[PDB]
Design a protein around this ligand. Structure first.
Ligand code: SAM
Ligand code: GMP
Length: 371
């Protein structure tokens, strides 16, 4: 895709309306959200969707109930807003306690147990006594375990729709919700001769330890540019996460802007910067959406998102490369790290004209210079 195509919001039809989608936004042609949309029925007056994506799963409630939506992805909020669907930039556990009659939760299984658990408790807390929860997911991705936990948290739960491995259950709040679990974790790491303490919420990439790929990029970077080759330079970190690249580069004296689509990750980076006596801009952004048209940089780094066992480069990751080329000043440099067999080489050749391979072992570090 072009950058314009990556950022474009496109309305798709459904009976009675339309819904905007875009590359990089969750919840479109997803069997879990699809099964929800076929299942959810109004109950009471006030509903909360704790994982809406583009908003298909709880869309049947719109216009029949007041529906609030809490969403962590910037890309997904751009879509919801375009669709005229009330939505807040919010973590699931930021939900108002006891203020809803119905909650909708597509299980965010890909973000892991801690994130799901926090979401389950947020759902239980959000509901008034006697409120109900639609819980949807995948038996191949923990549905039975999470449904068992939901039933323990709330009361009577039963599966109300089945399609292959995909399930929707309906549950009733019959008991008092517990307090939220402890959410913050911290760990320390030594990077390029300096100590960092990272802080993060649940669901972030590489919780609890620095990704070896990120370490490899930083090693390649320092070898190429020298210990001082970053001081006073403007750096963009595409997909900054809790700051594995961001913090060291700030420590090295760079003026760093991190862009990150996930709110939990943005807040994690902010806490880490504070904890380490470091300054950087930690932007909640779908790729470079948050930047001015004019912003350019001297150095751009990225450890892009990837599909678990995938052989194809994600749309977001392709956009990262296109954006890096576009956002670099002449003489600027780009560093990217990935699995050795992802086909980034042709992309860098097309966008920069040439590239170099600085490292290839467990991961590869590719490099390009803006001409
Ligand atoms: C492989 S992780 C790398 C995180 C961090 N830079 C590190 O090295 O540990 C990729 C990051 O890209 C972020 N991401 C995914 N889609 C994005 C998007 N559309 N815009 C910006 N960041 C995105 C993810 O949330 C994740 O934090
Ligand atoms: N950072 C990064 N890690 C990867 C990639 N492909 C596989 N992995 C991880 O490397 C190892 C496993 O933990 C995989 O999840 C990639 O493209 N980038």
């Amino acid at each position: 895709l072009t950058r314009e195509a990556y950022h474009r919001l496109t309305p798709l039809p459904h009976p009675g309306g339309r819904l905007f989608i875009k590359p990089g936004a969750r919840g479109y042609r997803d069997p879990v959200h699809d099964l929800l949309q076929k299942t959810v029925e109004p109950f009471g007056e006030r509903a909360l969707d704790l994982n809406p994506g583009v908003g298909w799963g709880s869309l049947p409630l719109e216009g029949r109930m007041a529906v609030e939506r809490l969403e962590t992805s910037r890309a997904a909020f751009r879509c919801l807003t375009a669709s005229g669907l009330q939505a807040r930039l919010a973590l699931p556990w930021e939900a108002a306690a006891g203020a809803y009659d119905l909650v909708v939760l597509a299980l965010p299984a890909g973000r892991g147990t801690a994130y799901v658990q926090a979401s389950l408790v947020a759902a239980a807390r959000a509901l008034r006594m006697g409120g109900r929860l639609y819980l949807a997911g995948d038996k191949n991705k923990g549905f039975e375990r999470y449904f068992k936990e939901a039933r323990a948290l709330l009361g009577y739960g039963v599966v109300v729709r089945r399609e292959g491995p995909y399930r929707v259950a309906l549950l009733e709040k019959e008991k008092e919700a517990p307090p939220l679990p402890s959410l913050w974790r911290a760990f320390s790491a030594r990077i390029l001769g300096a100590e960092y303490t990272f802080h993060h919420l649940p669901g972030v990439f590489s919780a609890g330890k620095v990704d070896p790929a990120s370490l490899l990029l930083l090693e390649a970077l320092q070898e190429r540019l020298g210990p001082e080759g970053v001081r006073g330079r403007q750096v963009l970190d595409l997909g900054a996460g809790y700051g594995a690249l961001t913090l060291p580069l700030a420590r090295m004296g760079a003026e760093v802007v991190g862009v990150e689509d996930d709110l939990a990750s943005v807040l994690s980076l902010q806490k880490g910067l504070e904890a380490n006596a470091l300054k950087a801009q930690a932007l909640h952004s779908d790729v470079d959406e948050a930047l001015t048209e004019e912003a350019r940089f001297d150095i751009i780094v990225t450890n892009p998102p990837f599909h678990v066992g995938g052989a194809v480069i994600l749309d977001v990751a392709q956009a990262f490369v296109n954006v890096a080329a576009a956002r670099l000043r002449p003489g600027g440099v780009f560093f990217l790290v990935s699995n050795p067999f992802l086909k980034y080489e042709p992309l860098l050749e097309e966008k920069f004209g040439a590239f170099q391979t600085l490292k290839v072992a467990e991961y590869k570090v590719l490099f390009a210079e803006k001409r």
